[PDB]
Structure formats: structure tokens, C-alpha cells
Amino acid sequence: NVAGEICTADTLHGHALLSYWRDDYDLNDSHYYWHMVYDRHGEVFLYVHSQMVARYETESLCWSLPLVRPWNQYDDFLENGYAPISSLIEHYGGYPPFSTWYSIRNPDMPDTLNVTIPRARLEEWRDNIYA
Amino acid sequence: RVSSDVRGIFALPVQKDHKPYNGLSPEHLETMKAVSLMLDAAGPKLEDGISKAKELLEERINPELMRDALGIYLTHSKDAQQRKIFPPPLKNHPFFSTNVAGEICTADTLHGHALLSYWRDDYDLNDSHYYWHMVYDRHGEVFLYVHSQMVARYETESLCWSLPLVRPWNQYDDFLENGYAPISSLIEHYGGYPPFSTWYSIRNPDMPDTLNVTIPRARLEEWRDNIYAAIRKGQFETTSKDKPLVLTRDNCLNFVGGILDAQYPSLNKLLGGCSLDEERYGNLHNYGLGKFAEMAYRNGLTISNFGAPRDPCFWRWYKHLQYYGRLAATRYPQDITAHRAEVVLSNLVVRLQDRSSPHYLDGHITTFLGPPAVNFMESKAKLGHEPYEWNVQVKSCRRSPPSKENPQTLTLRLFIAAEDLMNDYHSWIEMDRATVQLTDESAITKVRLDTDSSVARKMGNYGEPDPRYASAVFRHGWPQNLMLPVGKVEGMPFVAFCIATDDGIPPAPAPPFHHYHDPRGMGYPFNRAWTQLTEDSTGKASIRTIISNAELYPFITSTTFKIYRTTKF
Amino acid sequence: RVSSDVRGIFALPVQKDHKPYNGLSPEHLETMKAVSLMLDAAGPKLEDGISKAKELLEERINPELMRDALGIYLTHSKDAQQRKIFPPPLKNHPFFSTNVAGEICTADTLHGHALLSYWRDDYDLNDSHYYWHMVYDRHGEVFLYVHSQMVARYETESLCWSLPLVRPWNQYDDFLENGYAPISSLIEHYGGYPPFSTWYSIRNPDMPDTLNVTIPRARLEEWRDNIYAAIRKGQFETTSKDKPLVLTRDNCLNFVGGILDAQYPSLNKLLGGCSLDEERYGNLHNYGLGKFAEMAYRNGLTISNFGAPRDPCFWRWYKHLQYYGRLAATRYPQDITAHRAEVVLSNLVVRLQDRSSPHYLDGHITTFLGPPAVNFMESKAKLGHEPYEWNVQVKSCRRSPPSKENPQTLTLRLFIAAEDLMNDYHSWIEMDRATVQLTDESAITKVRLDTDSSVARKMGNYGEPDPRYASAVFRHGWPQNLMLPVGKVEGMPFVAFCIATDDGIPPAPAPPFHHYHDPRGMGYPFNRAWTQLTEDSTGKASIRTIISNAELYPFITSTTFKIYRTTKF
Ligand SMILES: [Zn+2]
Ligand SMILES: [Zn+2]
Ligand SMILES: [Zn+2]
């Protein structure tokens, strides 16, 4: 059975409508191959990603969805949640409404998969690059 | 050999030499039915009929015609039944073939009732109804009840997402202001129509005279107004000036319904040789469906009656059909106490089967919306529900207490309604009909599972069969997954209703007509108005007050539960 | 002295000794009308009638009764008219008094058509209609046309915000699924009803027998079904078995309309001494309104017919009234060319008056939504529009060219429709009726201002008077600010329609009945079906194709414009 997507008034909240854009196959193949490629290596990383942000914000405005709130505060909530298309949910899943970063560590996630980088460490780098 | 030949025939594709066929056109249907009969006349065994089929198919008759005709043949065939050969699943129809296109979920395509698409496109609903019209005394009454009943469910499902109530197709110059576009895997075979499409007043100019008999709008409107004005007078005029057919509280719905479906042969058998005036009352249902197909035609080609339930407009049409039910129901009320069972009902409960989820509670059940099977032509979701059960306590009332030697035998009738739509007879949705036999003076607790419902089609999702019900199946039952209205995330309030009736004494006809047999009228007690309410003088009376009065009407109990919506990715 | 005494009487508040009055109850109305007449019989001058008023008011008759009765008196009084004394503005009614409560704009209170509140609460619409029923051969025809016409506008306004089309009150067991709650300054005097309220089947238990004659539901339903079945047969049964009243294409609407409003005296004057069977056709409109008021009653007290247009349900009722228009209109078509004017229409334009805003364009006009005057009981907004004008070119066709000595005199009829609702006769909104007189063989460009419309009430916002129109006023005209449908921010497409008719030769009755006088039928040409379309044989014909054919029907021109929405804080 080929599972489709769930279009329901319960699953279209937030930016869920921009899913056609974010799930688009050619965007995903493009970007998939992109990180296989990658003097100007910083400049390209930053430009490419800033540029597909500008497009995503514009696409957001086109359906009159709210402008995207940057992840500038690291204690912020992901208030919408995310659930992959039903054909991918098998391999990996998403997260529920209002998920956050783990402050220190995900307890249930092995030390083999993840080096403990608590939140305050990232925040330090951020504040250090800012300054 | 035989079931293979069948799947072969059903798989045949229409080609460009084939005489065009319009499976929604009454005339084309009359032709189709004649080809059905044509097969039956080729012998008493299937091989005989199936030969006649290959025979005709080689002579280049239309493959879509043969499917409706071989379907009807297979369904009523003693040989076929006993050999348990059936018309294939709807999946085997050609339109279930051609990248897999999904559906378009866009803020531009969710206006109107487009959200109820998961319900209207649902595969098991479509197979159910597809087989239903292959099956079809009470032929009018069943047509009218079945379709009124899936209207009530669709309106309730509408209310669950807080969509507007459906506006009946009562004015024939009305617009279809939303439009309709089939799921992208079907758009190929047939398409839809744009926003604000109407019926053609006279005719679709671009639609051949071969596909469509010109039935202008004003003709249908005449039939409508003629049936309206009969129901009120109380009689249907006969071919003979002074011998009308008088509507009785018992016949009324079977005649209104049947005449709506132009089953004059059947009805005529009860007039003592008179005939109903077919020029006066016409064939409103089938031609009316004919006008919708006409409206969506674009330039002949072949049209099937495939995926009627999908089209949002057929539900506006079935709502108009229901209007005739509403008219007749309050003209001929019934006594609610007339067939009471000498018994007392208490403690009506709708529960989850799995009570080991505390905090759990009685009267809090649960539906879920999971992914649509796109390869089964579904869109948006695939409804389901965690397994439910209902029970009620039944204790006797009889002067002569029930004993192993002399059982009290009664029937329990389970209906539900959205608390909002509660005081309308026609919104109550039938959920079970169960026979209880008492042998003590003591109370019992009768338990009915969801999967045992007398209303439910006995299969799993996508026509997968129930071992427990190898015999019955009820392929044209109400799907299990759609048994529960979807509800709301907050827990939507519903009301449950049980009545106990003395039906005795009865004999269900032979297949495939065993299923809707009911001594009381199908949908009792909600099929006609209650003489308690029509003849009320206080003003205080309502369905609500009556089915809460456990003192005055103890063979009726009601209780309130909540249905909870849920998504399952 | 006199106008002061009038404002005095209209200001009188109902107290607790006053006999309860139900301004929506037919019986109470018959009583009220008798008190009206009672005043007129007190003399030919106003002082005479006004004395009778103080007289009765001291004898403790109901102040709300006196207002409806003094209003009708003042409106039809030769003395009053000539002394230009009128019933006061609606503002002077007591309910326009008691912190100023505003309206509640909350995501919980904007469901359904609650957004169209600015339109239904609009002060000038309410004063217009308030005075209208004080005014009211063609009495049925006007009732039916006026109310059908403000339905068409309300449905269009509905479409402008993309709200669902209004579901007619055609089934009397229907729910009012949205509820209604008056603006907070009115909630005191009267209140509304909750979601899913219905008519009481028999009676409101808590509503005194003094306020309400028990008219159960099934009785109204009988009238309905009886009028339905007349319109189809073509006749209205008379008190005398073999002399029915036969509907003609000319009488049909005045009789259907009048009978709907139980104006049997008036109609009976045209039957040559026969009477219409009042037991058969009843008083459906007024009792039907009576049932809505009944539904909203809560525990007698006094009810006024104040703010009918406000209640969302009266617009569902007027939609049902329109159904009778739709039924009769297609039964009795008319020839569209029957009264053509020997003339050729070209270049129909709807423009802004102020063309010095380039980039400006022909056919792009503009409405705005500003603040509601809360002290005038308005909610949500106060619609308005930048000043518009229309023009068309008119050039003659006559064998004998028009000369100063022998003018060609024709009439131009301006209608608009939402492009979506274009192919429905009954959605076209009348915008102007203008007389043109030609004296040359040459073309002219006829210009009509918005403020000169034959449809428009000649006042500024809130009943402020027009110097230019001291005489005419048309207090019960369609408000100027609501002349233009609101439109969409994107520019909503509309279609404009002009027809030229030869009306000659005619004599408008005396006030206050001069205004709806039209030799052709009010609303012509859209008041009946077109025999061009009913008798079409191709299928290709539509209102669209006809009013685009400038070759075949040159006395008809159409053009497309766009209305643009706007907010003005
Ligand atoms: Zn990247
Ligand atoms: Zn069906
Ligand atoms: Zn009115």
C-alpha cells in the first residue's frame, strides 16, 4: 500500500502548507548532491543557505503565512511539530508540538550516536561569534 | 477457470469502436439491465452466462456496460451464490490503473466540503455502495432509508470539523459553488466541474444525443412538484381517474421512495391491477443523477457510474431525496409506545473494548485519522476507530416472568445523534439491531461489539474478509472504519439511544436481500414522526424530553458519550 | 407643537401595567392597524389624530403599539404629507437609549455570517426598511420584489467575503446553526437565540397565550405546500368550487406575493366578487416571522418588530420567500424582445466620478469600510463607496428619425450581477431606471450619477437629507452607502446590464406609493424567465450569451467592471 499524506484541518497548522516546497523531490536531490560537493567555501555555504531562506520566506508570504521566526533563541519551542510524509515515517520520525533542544542530553539516545553537547555550549559559540 | 474469466471480463478496457455507454443514463441503464437478463437467459449455471458474455464482448458490446451487467448477473444467480463466486472488488475495475499522483492539499483546494474527501473517497465506502446498487417488498423504503442514512452521517461528519451544514439540492437552479476535482489518479478517466456549475436548463450542447436523452430542467421540476403535492394530498394518482393509491403510515415511505426511483413494476404489483401514472411522477432520482453527469461533461465517450459517492454534489442530491422523507415522515406519525417490549432499560454505555488504559472512562471513545491508501483511490485520510462496544441492562416487566420454557424475546435498537442535531428525527444514525432473549426475572447486561453490528459490513479495511463472518459479510454494509463519526479533538458530545420493541412474530428474504429486513420499518423508531410530539399540547415535548423520561418510557434509555479525534501518522 | 407631540409619543416607554404587545404577531398587528385607523377617524387634521393618541395613551394602551400605529397614521395622512410632518427617524425609538457597549469581535463570535453584521445592522438600511413597512394595485408584487432584491444583495455581499451561500428556510424543521446575538446596546430590550435553535413544533411553553397564537409548525407547512401546488397547477382556488383564479404571466407574481403576505382584501378586489380561500393559503409570511420571534422568546413582555433586518434568520426567511419567486418566474416566461426600444446601445461604463487619480481606469470602482456608528446601533463597520456614475451610448433605430417635434422616448434599465451568479435571473441587482428622450438621429452619451438612482434613498448617512431631493427622499429607498456590493481587495468581477424598453404610453400613484411604479413589472427584465432560454433548443443559450449578443439584441448591452474593497480607519 502506498501511503499518501494526511490533509486534515488538524495537520495544516503553522507552515505545514509549505510542505510541497520542502518535500519537493528536485530540491531534495539538489541539496543532497550539494553537500557532496561541499577559496570561498564559507561564503558559498552562507550564501546558498541564506538564499534558500529568502525564497522560503517569500513562498511563506505568498500564502499569507506568518514570517519565519529565526532560531535565535536556543531555548525556543518548535510549536508546530513535524511529521514526515507517511512513506518516510518508517525510517525516521518527527517530533511533537513544542519540542525543544535538550538542555544537556537526550537520556534515551546512546553515547555512541551522540556526543553530549549541552545547550549552553552552543550558546557560547554563538555569543562568541556575535561579539 | 470461472473466477478467472470473470476477472478477465471486468478488466476489459473501452476502446474507440465501442458504442458509447452512459452508466448514469436511465435509458442506457434499461439497455444494460436487458443485457443482464440476457445472460441469465443463457442458462442456470455461470458458465452459461459467462459464455453469453464473451459472445457479446466479441460482438463488440461496451466493456463498461458488461461490467454493470455481469455484476448484476453474478449478484443474483443461485449458481453463483452457492459457488460463492461474486462480482470482483472495486479495485479490479480498470480506473484503478493508468508516477503515482497524490492529492493536492493547498489553501486553494480546501474550500467548501473538500475536507470531507477522505470520507467520500474512502475505499470501503465506495466498494460497499458499488455493490449495493448491484443488489438493488420494500425496495423503495430501502433506497430511501439507506441514502437518507448516509446523508445523516455525512452531515454529522460535516459538523465534526465545524463545516457548514449541507444545503439540499431543493432548488434545481442552484449553483455548485465549490466545484469538484477527482483524485489525480481518476482525473484521467473522468473529470469534474468548475465553481458555480449548474444543471443545463435544456441540454449540454457538446454532449451527443447518444449519451444523453434531453431532459430539460423544467421537466424534472415538474415531477418534483408533482410528488410534493401528492405526499400532501395523501395519494398517488393512478392511470385510472377515480382509484388513487392512498398513502398509509405503513406504505407511505416505500411508495415515495420507490416512485423517486421509478420502480413502478414493483410498486404496481400492490395496486390490484392499477398502475401509477409514470407520466406524472417520472423517474426523478435517476434522471437527476443524469443531469449531474451531464453538467460535468466536456468536449462521444463512455461514462460510468463509478465513484458517485465521491462527488460532493451527489450528497447534495441525497439531501434532497431526504426532503421527501421529511415530508412524509411528519404526515404519518407513529405511536412510540405502540410496540414497546415489556422490559426496562437501564445503564446504556458506549465503551472502548480495551479498558486497560487508565485513566480511561466509560463513554469516552476514540477515532483516528491515518494515511490514505492512494492506490485504492483514497484522499486525505483513512478514518478508523479504536474498537468499541455498547451495552445496556435489560430487566423484565412481564406479568408472566420469563422462563426457559417461555422466553421473552425482544429487540434492542441502537441509534446515535450529535447532541446538536438531536431533536431532528432524521439525524439519528442507526448503530445496531440486536435480539435479546430473557429466561429469568433477573437483569442482564447485553454486550454488543462494534464488529458484530447489524449495520456494519463484515470486512477489514480494503475488503479483507472476516473469518468470523464468512457467511454474512454484508459487503454492502456500512464500513467498519466509518462506523463512528470522526468527532472533535476536544471530545465531541453525542447521544446514544436504545429502544426495546416487541417485534414478534415473524422471515428474511433470500440473499442477497436478507439484510434490511425489519418488521417495524427500517430505521424505526426514527423513520416517522412521533405521535407523542405531533400531538403535543404543552410545547415542552421533544425527542430529548421523551428519551430522558425513564419513568414514562422505561423501554427507552439514553446516555451521553464523547467521541475524540486523533491523528495516527 | 405637532412634531414635538409626535416625538413625545414615540419616546414613550413600555411599563409594567401595559397590556403586552407583539409587533410580529398577526393578531396583534390587526389590532394595531385598527388603532391606526382609529386615529384617522378622529379627523382630517393631525391635531385630531394626535389627540386621539394622547387620549388612548392615557387610557394606558401600549406605547410600542402606538408607535407602529402612529407611524402608519402619519405616513398616510394627506394633512401630514402636505405639512411635511413624518414619522421620526428610527433613532428616536426608545431602544436607542439605555458605559457604551461595543460589539464583541472574538474568534468565537465570527462564525457563520456574523461578518455580514455591518450590513444587517447598518443604520440606514434599518431606517429604510422600518419606514418601508409603514408604507406597505401591485402590493404583492412589491413585497415580493423588494424582499427578493435585498436577498440578492445579501447573497452577493456574502460571496464578496467568500462566505457560504445562504441556505433558504425551505425546510421548516431546519436548524439555525449559528445563533444570533444583537449588538450589546440592544441586548437589553431583546435578545437572540443559541446555536441550533429551531421553530417550536407546537408552541413555546414559556410564552404567554396573550403574546402568541399557537400556530404549530405543521400548519405553516400546509400553507407552504398549498401555495407550492397552486403555482404549479396555475391557479389559486377560490371560495367557490369552479371559479379558480388563473395565474397569468402578468398577474402571477402579484398574487403569489400578496397571498404570501395575506393581503386578501386587496387581491379580492380583482376576482369579480369571488374570494381567495384564506383557509387554504393562510398568512405564511407574517406567521412565519411570528415563529422566529417565538423561537427567541425567553422567560408577558412586549416584542417590537424593531430590527428585523438584523437577525440572520430573517434573511434565511426572505430567501424562502424568493423561492416562490423562482417557482413562478419560470412557469410564466416573457419575450425579451417584446418591448424593445427602437434603439442601439453601446459602450456601457461604470466609472468613478473622480477621474483625476491616474493611474485610474474605466470600470474600476471602489468601496470602503469605515467605523460603525455605535450610537446608531451599528456593528463592525459602516460601508460606503467612492461616488460612481454609469453611462451608455444611445443611438436611434426608428424609421422615422427622432425630431424635436416627435421624440423617441425610451427607458434605460440598469442591473448588475456578480460574474459568478450571472446566469441566475434572480441575482441581478437593479441599479437604475432612467428615462431618455431623443431628438436627433445622432448618438448621445447618457450619464447617471449614483446619487440620482431611481433605486436609491435620497439621503446622506444617518438620515441626513439631500437638498437636491427635498421632494423625493425615498426614505424607504435602498441606502446610498449600500448601493455598491462591497467587493474584494483584489477587485471582484461584476457584470453590468442595460436594456432599452419602449414603455409608452403611461401614471404613478400618489404618495407614498409613487416609487415602485413600473409599466413593465418591477425588476424587468429579470422578474420572469426569458422565453429565449426556456424555449431554447440548442442548449447553448444563457443570460450570458444573450446579453453579449449586440448583433441579435442591440437594445441590450453589457460590460464588465471590478469592485475594489478598502478600509478607511
Ligand atoms: Zn544545506
Ligand atoms: Zn446510491
Ligand atoms: Zn420587510
Author numbering:
A (entry chain A): 146 to 183, 198 to 290
B (entry chain A), C (entry chain A): 42 to 139, 146 to 183, 198 to 360, 369 to 575, 577 to 639
Give the text the authors published on this PDB structure.
Our experimental results clearly indicate that the hemocyanin-like protein AsqI is the cyclopenase, which is the enzyme in the viridicatin biosynthetic pathway that has eluded isolation for nearly four decades. Biochemical analysis reveals AsqI as a metalloprotein that requires zinc for its activity. In this reaction, the active-site zinc ion acts as a Lewis acid catalyst to activate the substrate epoxide and facilitate essentially an anti-Baldwin-type epoxide-opening 6-endo-tet cyclization. Subsequently, the conversion of a 6,7-bicyclic skeleton into a 6,6-bicyclic quinolone framework occurs upon elimination of 7 and the following keto–enol tautomerization results in the formation of the product.
Next, to establish the active-site architecture, the crystal structure of AsqI was determined. Based on the structure and the sequence homology of AsqI to hemocyanin, residues His176, His180, and His208 were identified to form the metal-binding site A in AsqI. However, the second tri-histidine metal-binding site B found in hemocyanins was formed by His346, Leu350, and Y387 in AsqI and no metal ion was observed there. While His346Ala mutation did not reduce the activity of AsqI, alanine mutation of each of the site-A histidine residues resulted in a nearly complete loss of activity, suggesting that the site-A metal plays a crucial role in substrate binding and catalysis. When AsqI was treated with ethylenediaminetetraacetic acid, it completely lost its cyclopenase activity. However, re-introduction of different metal ions (Fe2+, Fe3+, Co2+, Mn2+, Ni2+, Cu2+, and Zn2+) led to a varying degree of recovery of the activity, with zinc ion achieving the most outstanding recovery. Supplementing the reaction mixture with 30 µM ZnCl2 doubled kcat to 16.0 ± 0.30 min–1 but had a little effect on Km, which was 0.066 ± 0.0052 mM, indicating the important catalytic role the metal ion plays. To account for the role of zinc and the enzyme in the reaction of 5, we also optimized the structure of 5 in complex with Zn2+ and two imidazole molecules, which model the two histidine side chain groups identified experimentally as the metal ligands. The structure shows that the metal ion is coordinated to the imidazole molecules and the epoxide and C2 amide oxygen atoms of the substrate in a tetrahedral arrangement as frequently observed in zinc-complexed protein structures.
